[PDB]
Design a protein around this ligand. Sequence first.
Ligand code: HEM
Ligand SMILES: Clc1ccc(-n2ccnc2)cc1
Length: 465
Amino acid sequence: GKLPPGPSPLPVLGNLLQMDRKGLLRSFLRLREKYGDVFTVYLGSRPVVVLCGTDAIREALVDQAEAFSGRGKIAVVDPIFQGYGVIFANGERWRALRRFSLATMRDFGMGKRSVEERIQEEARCLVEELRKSKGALLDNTLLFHSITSNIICSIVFGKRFDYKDPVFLRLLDLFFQSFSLISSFSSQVFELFSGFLKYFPGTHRQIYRNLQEINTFIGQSVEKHRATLDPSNPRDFIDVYLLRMEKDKSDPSSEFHHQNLILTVLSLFFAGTETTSTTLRYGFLLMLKYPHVTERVQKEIEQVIGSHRPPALDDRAKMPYTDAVIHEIQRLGDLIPFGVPHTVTKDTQFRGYVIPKNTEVFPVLSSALHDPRYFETPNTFNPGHFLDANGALKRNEGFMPFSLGKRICLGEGIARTELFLFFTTILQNFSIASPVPPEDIDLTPRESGVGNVPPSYQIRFLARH
Ligand code: HEM
Ligand SMILES: Clc1ccc(-n2ccnc2)cc1
């Protein structure tokens, strides 16, 4: 049986000595050199199994997507989730919420259409709020978080917030700031010595007080939604959850109990707002480094969508180039370097090693988007990776930014749609430009932990006439 190869760990400390100074990801890469694609590492006491390569990630999450369908714990945030919510819940509790939220939000907009029209709309706004900026050097960080947040809030909270609404701007600002702490160094030195450090002050405390405020807003908005619930017509995700939360109060095992409502509404409100938004942020920072790549996208929009009607989702097909630039933005982006933690649900048999039940598994996704076996020139923005000789969209076994298996990003649908509608609708109406010389544009992440934060930058949105 035995666990995969890795360095011999010391008591308490685990393989802390073999760890690279830069952080976790870098470390897993420096060990893959000595052991290869699949190997074992001990983060302090807890042994994890790292997975590198496009192959290893699928042989596990795709070909045995049941023994790996288990969610692990993320150091700094377990305190607030304690295993609840739809993202961190396990076993039956997981399927319980997963299916519910996947179904609730779906037949409430998501799925397709109702949301598409919602996005073209939110985008329409993002376009007039940008005209207002009269193309003055701004910081799209906040604004971006807004447009992707509204899309999700309309599904969960049902309502939509104004771009300059103080409350709204605080949750957003809170999400951003928090993701940045969740991906900092402590958020990692914690993963290791969480039990050790938690007794002393640090950023781990700040991540708590942060999610707190949000949980409040979530919570105090559950009350508002409470006294206004017209069972004959639910308004959003909260109502539906409320209708079934009240319904099953005779089954003291129904995972539908506040704890979840808040933590699930937080999982969908944080992710739904966070990633899609910083992907575009990274996207555009990449559109300044390569202005010649923008001209094309703005031309492909011109041939297809023309320029007298907002981009529709259908257009993603007739626009194979822009599709590839996005897959490439997403690929180089790599917002989630080593995917949210996993765990085998049973004694699993993998490649010749026997991973005991409940053993944490990290699917280094970064080493799948950057894999040389599937991506020629993986470290170079190359819309080619996703195209054939006849210049058409081509699939690629290495493109797994949302991940794979039963734990695959619940919101892959929305996201891919939001990206294509916002991204083109903007480039359709505006033409980015920034004071920094393209060769000087740096894409190195500002923070790289469980998440990759693109450095902050200024960009002006010159209107196109
Ligand atoms: C730029 C877009 C996005 C990217 C790159 C992304 C990334 C991912 C990744 C890498 C995971 C972990 C998969 C795993 O367990 O191995 C995940 C999970 C998750 N994401 Fe996203 N995500 C995106 C947007 C969204 C959106 C728009 C929502 C909200 C509707 C969302 C909600 C979720 C949820 C609920 C999970 C947990 C799923 C589960 O436990 O089964 N994400 N996503
Ligand atoms: Cl702790 C954590 C992990 C993943 C996500 N996420 C973001 C987008 N999809 C998943 C949010 C929070």
